[PDB]
Design a protein around this motif. Structure first.
Motif, mmCIF file in Angstrom:
data_model
loop_
_atom_site.group_PDB
_atom_site.id
_atom_site.type_symbol
_atom_site.label_atom_id
_atom_site.label_comp_id
_atom_site.label_asym_id
_atom_site.label_seq_id
_atom_site.Cartn_x
_atom_site.Cartn_y
_atom_site.Cartn_z
ATOM 1 N N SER A 59 70.358 122.631 17.612
ATOM 2 C CA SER A 59 68.894 123.003 16.774
ATOM 3 C C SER A 59 69.174 123.204 15.217
ATOM 4 O O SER A 59 68.105 123.270 14.714
ATOM 5 N N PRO A 92 65.436 119.952 23.231
ATOM 6 C CA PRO A 92 64.565 120.659 22.123
ATOM 7 C C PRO A 92 63.205 121.419 22.631
ATOM 8 O O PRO A 92 62.955 122.430 22.326
ATOM 9 N N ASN A 140 65.225 123.905 24.803
ATOM 10 C CA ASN A 140 66.300 124.376 24.186
ATOM 11 C C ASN A 140 67.654 124.436 25.110
ATOM 12 O O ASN A 140 68.016 125.626 25.156
ATOM 13 N N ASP A 185 72.026 123.513 23.855
ATOM 14 C CA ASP A 185 71.895 123.444 22.338
ATOM 15 C C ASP A 185 73.307 123.916 21.874
ATOM 16 O O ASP A 185 73.764 124.778 21.685
#
Ligand SMILES: *[C@@H]1O[C@H](CO)[C@@H](O[C@H]2O[C@H](CO)[C@@H](O)[C@H](O)[C@H]2NC(C)=O)[C@H](O)[C@H]1NC(C)=O
Ligand SMILES: *[C@@H]1O[C@H](CO)[C@@H](O)[C@H](O)[C@H]1NC(C)=O
Ligand SMILES: *[C@@H]1O[C@H](CO)[C@@H](O)[C@H](O)[C@H]1NC(C)=O
Length: 225
Positions: free
Chosen positions: A41, A83, A86, A89
């Motif tokens: 991220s 994304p 999430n 990540d």
């Protein structure tokens, strides 16, 4: 980092500072002389991966020439990062060259595949992130003492934490930074619930990616093209 103390030089020598045009965007940890583990991220863009990686730093404001090490990223790898939710990540950065292992730069070890950390366990997290929602970064590193929460307010892919005192935890600039418990990297700071230091900091479960990581470390090339 909210609710923590100021660190002393070399207190966490594994610690990395990911930069963009010299500005600090995120944290990381040195896990192999040629790799740095961090959050996928951090890797959104607006000038995508044209970033640098500074090892051995302390005071973000100085050059600290005789202690730092500067590197460019040859490659980047991830495993199913997503994304929207999430998930997964986590991302590894391959350095342009071998990091020299000094007193100000060292390796953070990794848990074995599938390992766990019980609720109630004591860990620490550290970084140059701010002390408040939308606030200036910290020039020096800071650290706080955390505690692993019960699984029911977390998620399976994660490992959550809280502080006994309101306000403690991660904040802007803290993304990618590691949660260390029992001297091992059990986490990679992902995101946080609401107002910095409020309740449930979400960290990626590193113990789930162990064999994959070993996979990347062992066959170091840039991937296909
Ligand atoms: C770690 O645990 C998992 C689950 O207990 C074991 O196998 C699982 O892994 C397989 C390959 O991805 C999957 O096909 C199963 O869906 C999966 N279940 C979960 C939820 O991941 C795996 O063998 C264990 N490995 C070791 C080394 O302990
Ligand atoms: C150690 O690494 C640095 C930074 O990557 C490099 O410039 C240097 O040559 C190495 N030091 C020794 C004394 O070779
Ligand atoms: C970390 O925990 C130890 C032991 O409880 C304590 O003495 C210290 O104040 C804590 N530090 C932070 C920075 O919360």
């Amino acid at each position: 980092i909210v609710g923590g103390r100021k660190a002393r030089p070399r207190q966490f020598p594994f610690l990395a500072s990911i930069q963009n045009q010299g500005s600090h965007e995120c944290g990381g940890a040195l896990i192999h002389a040629r790799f740095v583990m961090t959050a996928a991220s951090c890797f959104q863009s607006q000038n995508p991966g044209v970033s640098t990686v500074v090892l051995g730093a302390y005071d973000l404001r100085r050059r600290e020439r005789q202690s730092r090490q500067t590197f460019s990223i040859s490659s980047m790898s991830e495993n199913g990062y997503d994304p929207q939710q999430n998930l997964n990540d986590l991302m590894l950065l391959q350095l342009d060259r071998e990091a020299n292992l000094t007193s100000s730069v060292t390796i953070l070890p990794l848990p074995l595949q599938n390992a766990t950390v019980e609720a109630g366990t004591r860990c620490q997290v550290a970084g140059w992130g701010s002390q408040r929602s939308g606030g200036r970064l910290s020039r020096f590193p800071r650290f706080v003492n955390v505690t692993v929460t019960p699984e029911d307010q977390c998620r399976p892919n994660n490992v959550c934490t809280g502080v006994l005192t309101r306000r403690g935890g991660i904040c802007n600039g803290d993304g990618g930074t590691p949660l260390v418990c029992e001297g091992l990297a059990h986490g990679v700071a992902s995101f946080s619930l609401g107002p910095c230091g409020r309740g449930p900091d979400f960290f990626t479960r590193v113990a789930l990616f162990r064999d994959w990581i070993d996979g990347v470390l062992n066959n170091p090339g840039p991937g296909p093209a």
